[PDB]
Every structure is written in C-alpha cells, then in structure tokens.
C-alpha cells in the first residue's frame, strides 16, 4: 500500500498492529 506518514503512528490505519517504520515519507510494514 501507499500511505504517506511523518511518524509510524500515522500508519496505524493501514498497518494495524504490524511492526514497521515511517521511512522515505511512507509507511513500511511489508504490505505494498
């Protein structure tokens, strides 16, 4: 998936409980 973020908390909607990071402006929790 493409979801922009500034911090990983911004990724909660798309990443749910998955571990990951906000990097290069986007959510990185393996899903595309």
């Amino acid at each position: 998936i493409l979801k922009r973020c500034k911090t990983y908390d911004d990724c909660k909607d798309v990443c749910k409980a998955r571990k990951g990071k906000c990097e290069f402006g986007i959510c990185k929790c393996m899903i595309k």
Partner: protein, 223 residues
C-alpha cells in the same frame, strides 16, 4: 513497480487505481461491476479509477466510480496477511471498451516458472520513493514455493506465492498492492507484500487467486 517499463496507455485495460484522495492501491476489473484487490487496501470511501494511464492528468478515458461495497475476505488476517483479497462492487457499472476491459479468472492454479505481467503505479525505486505518472509493467516468473519459504521462513501460506527475481532489481512496491498478476490471460495473483522492494532474495509475495474463485463467484452472487 521497480525495474519495469512503461506499459503504454490503456494496454492493461483491466488495471484500476484505488483512490481515497490519492492513489494508494491497484485492482483488477473482473466484470463491469466488480474489482479484485487486496484486503489490506480496504478503506471506506474508495473511488475506483478505470481507464487510467497518467494518474495525474485527465486524458479522456477515465471512469471514476465509487465503491458501493468493499467485501474483504471474512478470514483475512492483517497479521499474517493470509486471505489478502477483497472484492469491490462499483456503485454503477463501468462501460467496457478497448481501454476498460475485464480480466478472466483462473480455472486452475498457475505453476512455478510461468511468466506473468505485474503492473501498477507504485514506487519505482528500490531505495527511496518515486511516484510515476503513467502505468508501469513488469514481466516476472512465479517462483518455487521452496525458494519462497526459504526467502520468507514461517510466513508463506498456501494462499500466497512468490514471483520475481531472487537477484533483485525487479519487483512490485508500495502503491502496487491490490493490482494484477496476470499469467496466460488469467488473473492468478494480487500484489500483497514483501520485505522492501526488489531486494536480493526477497521477492514479492502475491495472493493466490485460484484458491478464491468459488468465494469470488459466491460474493458476486450475494451482492
């Protein structure tokens, strides 16, 4: 898509863009009223954009149709990514033509070694983030389950397959999720997940559509 090529306008007429204010996932048109995508692409208020090439410019073949229903597989697991499939019903039927057309569902599963076409508007960089304007395409083979499980120990279910290149450099990426993997004219995969993009020994993982043909048919009927 990393390491791919420009498809050419409307040469993948079943490819759709899912838009919730911006492009976030792909999908595949399977009939005039229904789109297959990934369960993790679910959001409320999805607008399906058909007939797109340049997703930033109005070129004259677009149909923008909101989802009336987004039916995630009831057994989708957002932790394991098992059953990562969703059906979107369009609020109204799309007009089918040369540039907006459906893709056939498989009657049997594909085999390792078969070449497939993967497409999308996702990131084109293995390091960093780009956003292409026009649709990108990649030819990639289905990989053995053994190499898939070696690349992703403990993570590959019967509803997933790997496709791509263990050497790296060619893969689907963020923004491609939900889009098509088409092999011998059949929608065999949905872009799902991977460890980064185009990394050595981390090929893309795809939802195995052939395991869901019955569910797709019953969901269309139920809605």
């Amino acid at each position: 898509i990393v390491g791919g090529y420009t498809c050419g306008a409307n040469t993948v007429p079943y490819q759709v863009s899912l838009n919730s204010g911006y492009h976030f996932c792909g999908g595949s048109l399977i009939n005039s009223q229904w789109v297959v995508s990934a369960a993790h692409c679910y959001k409320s208020g999805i607008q399906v954009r058909l007939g797109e090439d340049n997703i930033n410019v109005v070129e004259g073949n677009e149909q923008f149709i909101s989802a009336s229903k987004s039916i995630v597989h009831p057994s989708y697991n957002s932790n394991t990514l098992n059953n990562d499939i969703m059906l979107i019903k369009l609020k109204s039927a799309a007009s089918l033509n040369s540039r907006v057309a459906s893709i056939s569902l498989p009657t049997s599963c594909a085999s390792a070694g078969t070449q497939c076409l993967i497409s999308g508007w996702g990131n084109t960089k293995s390091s960093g983030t780009s956003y292409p304007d026009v649709l990108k395409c990649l030819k990639a083979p289905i990989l053995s389950d053994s190499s898939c499980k070696s690349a992703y120990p403990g993570q590959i279910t019967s509803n997933m397959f790997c496709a791509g290149y263990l050497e790296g450099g060619k893969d689907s990426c963020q923004g491609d999720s939900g889009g098509p993997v088409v092999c011998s004219g059949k929608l065999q995969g949905i872009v799902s997940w991977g460890s980064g993009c185009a990394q050595k020994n981390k090929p893309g993982v795809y939802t195995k559509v052939c395991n869901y043909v019955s569910w797709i048919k019953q969901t269309i009927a139920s809605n």
